[PDB]
Amino acid sequence: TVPDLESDSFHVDWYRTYAELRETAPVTPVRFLGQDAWLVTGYDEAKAALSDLRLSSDPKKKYPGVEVEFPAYLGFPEDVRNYFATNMGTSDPPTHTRLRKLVSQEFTVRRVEAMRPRVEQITAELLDEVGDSGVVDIVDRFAHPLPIKVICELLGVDEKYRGEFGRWSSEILVMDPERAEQRGQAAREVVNFILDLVERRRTEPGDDLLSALIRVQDDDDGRLSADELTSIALVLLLAGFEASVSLIGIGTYLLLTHPDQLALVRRDPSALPNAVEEILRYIAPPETTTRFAAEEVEIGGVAIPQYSTVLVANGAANRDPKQFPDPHRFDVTRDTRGHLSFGQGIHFCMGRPLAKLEGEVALRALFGRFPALSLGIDADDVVWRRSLLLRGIDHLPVRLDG
Numbered sequence: 001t002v003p004d005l006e007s008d009s010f011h012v013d014w015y016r017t018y019a020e021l022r023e024t025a026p027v028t029p030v031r032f033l034g035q036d037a038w039l040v041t042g043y044d045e046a047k048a049a050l051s052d053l054r055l056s057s058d059p060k061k062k063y064p065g066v067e068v069e070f071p072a073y074l075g076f077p078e079d080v081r082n083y084f085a086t087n088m089g090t091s092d093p094p095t096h097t098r099l100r101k102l103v104s105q106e107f108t109v110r111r112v113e114a115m116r117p118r119v120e121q122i123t124a125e126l127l128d129e130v131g132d133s134g135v136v137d138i139v140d141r142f143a144h145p146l147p148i149k150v151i152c153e154l155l156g157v158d159e160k161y162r163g164e165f166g167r168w169s170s171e172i173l174v175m176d177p178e179r180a181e182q183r184g185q186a187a188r189e190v191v192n193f194i195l196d197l198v199e200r201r202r203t204e205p206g207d208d209l210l211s212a213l214i215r216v217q218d219d220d221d222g223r224l225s226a227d228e229l230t231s232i233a234l235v236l237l238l239a240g241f242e243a244s245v246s247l248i249g250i251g252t253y254l255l256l257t258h259p260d261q262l263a264l265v266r267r268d269p270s271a272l273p274n275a276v277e278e279i280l281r282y283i284a285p286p287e288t289t290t291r292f293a294a295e296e297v298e299i300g301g302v303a304i305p306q307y308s309t310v311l312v313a314n315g316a317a318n319r320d321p322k323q324f325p326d327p328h329r330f331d332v333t334r335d336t337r338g339h340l341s342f343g344q345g346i347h348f349c350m351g352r353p354l355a356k357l358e359g360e361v362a363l364r365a366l367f368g369r370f371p372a373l374s375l376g377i378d379a380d381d382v383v384w385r386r387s388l389l390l391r392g393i394d395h396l397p398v399r400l401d402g
């Protein structure tokens with residue numbers, strides 16, 4: 001019986017489901033969105049897969065008699081897919097190399113650190129607005145607005161252009177065959193929004209990251225083409241805040257349900273950085289990441305046939321007991337080195353410095369401002385986003401004063 005990634009087994013106590021699969025076959029056939037695929041749940045296997053470049057990240061490449069379909073582009077018209085997939089994460093070397101090197105020249109640690117004061121101020125202002133007591137949805141009031149405001153400032157997106165794309169991005173995070181048309185339509189809205197944003201930045205340059213990317217170049221890697229610039233801007237906008245929203249929300253939930261863990265962090269401030277790493281290891285937002293077998297590729301003693309769609313379960317790998325002992329225990333003091341929540345290999349997250357900064361500042365500020373913060377509902381009643389693309393929490397009631 002081939003597992004169906006659409007079943008509740010993968011959205012209800014799903015890490016137990018992953019453990020059962022890993023135990024039987026760390027690399028096994030599955031069904032998803034009406035197509036055959038291979039799910040990799042073992043840590044060694046997942047790391048090997050992400051390191052094997054025969055497993056391509058480019059959905060635009062064409063192969064004779066093959067119709068390449070990445071689950072994440074469900075409902076996307078071809079031109080829209082291209083707008084979404086002409087960037088680092090959707091490119092293979094040598095294209096990937098050139099794009100990443102050019103973007104790395106401007107998306108630096110220096111630029112990220114320069115934003116630290118802004119992240120702190122935005123965080124402070126959002127917390128100032130929730131009051132001192134009562135129940136509030138910490139996602140709508142904090143976890144979601146902080147990252148979205150930060151990415152907008154990083155990319156030169158004016159205030160008048162912010163309270164809208166969040167809704168489209170949300171529809172895109174879920175992959176429901178029933179809403180394939182609406183998903184494709186939300187995608188087109190994001191494209192149109194980015195096209196107007198780039199147009200505005202080209203005519204009115206600033207000191208933001210997008211303005212800089214419009215000018216970036218180098219003798220060897222040349223520069224970003226119009227299509228590359230637009231697509232990179234699009235992914236930087238979406239990935240630039242959604243993963244962070246998931247981190248802050250999941251992090252808040254985990255600390256609220258692990259009193260011992262929270263106490264330790266509050267006790268020793270130097271322990272916060274690793275707490276964020278453990279939060280990402282425990283429940284990775286990018287639960288699975290997709291690859292396409294350009295050639296036959298053997299992983300874990302299993303021959304993945306050419307043209308196969310491979311779903312590397314980053315999250316499942318993080319709970320492989322062979323790599324992370326007592327994997328189901330959330331321990332902010334554990335050695336988290338090696339987790340795959342930021343990827344592995346040439347596509348390793350470019351936003352890691354900003355993600356860690358946002359998580360550290362956000363959680364430190366939230367739990368520091370509200371010492372009696374408690375969950376507004378039973379832990380078992382929290383609703384987890386039904387998505388293998390980006391796991392997270394969209395609504396989380398909390399009691400500001402316990």
Ligand code: HEM
Binds near residue numbers: 350
């Ligand atoms: C907690 C938050 C974050 C997590 C968990 C995360 C996770 C990841 C993962 C798993 C990958 C590799 C994907 C693959 O192998 O196909 C990745 C790639 C990347 N991330 Fe993040 N990310 C986060 C935040 C950010 C932020 C804030 C930005 C931008 C502002 C960002 C920009 C990117 C880019 C551009 C890549 C593509 C790199 C490449 O393909 O060479 N990430 N991220």
Ligand SMILES: CC[C@H]1OC(=O)[C@H](C)[C@@H](O)[C@H](C)[C@@H](O)[C@@H](C)C[C@@H](C)C(=O)[C@H](C)[C@@H](O)[C@H]1C
Binds near residue numbers: 072084090172389
């Ligand atoms: C709809 C499909 C796309 O998803 C998204 O952009 C999601 C909103 C983001 O949260 C994803 C999950 C990121 O966080 C990173 C893991 C990967 C990202 C940087 C890529 O480059 C990747 C090609 C990506 O754009 C697509 C999978």
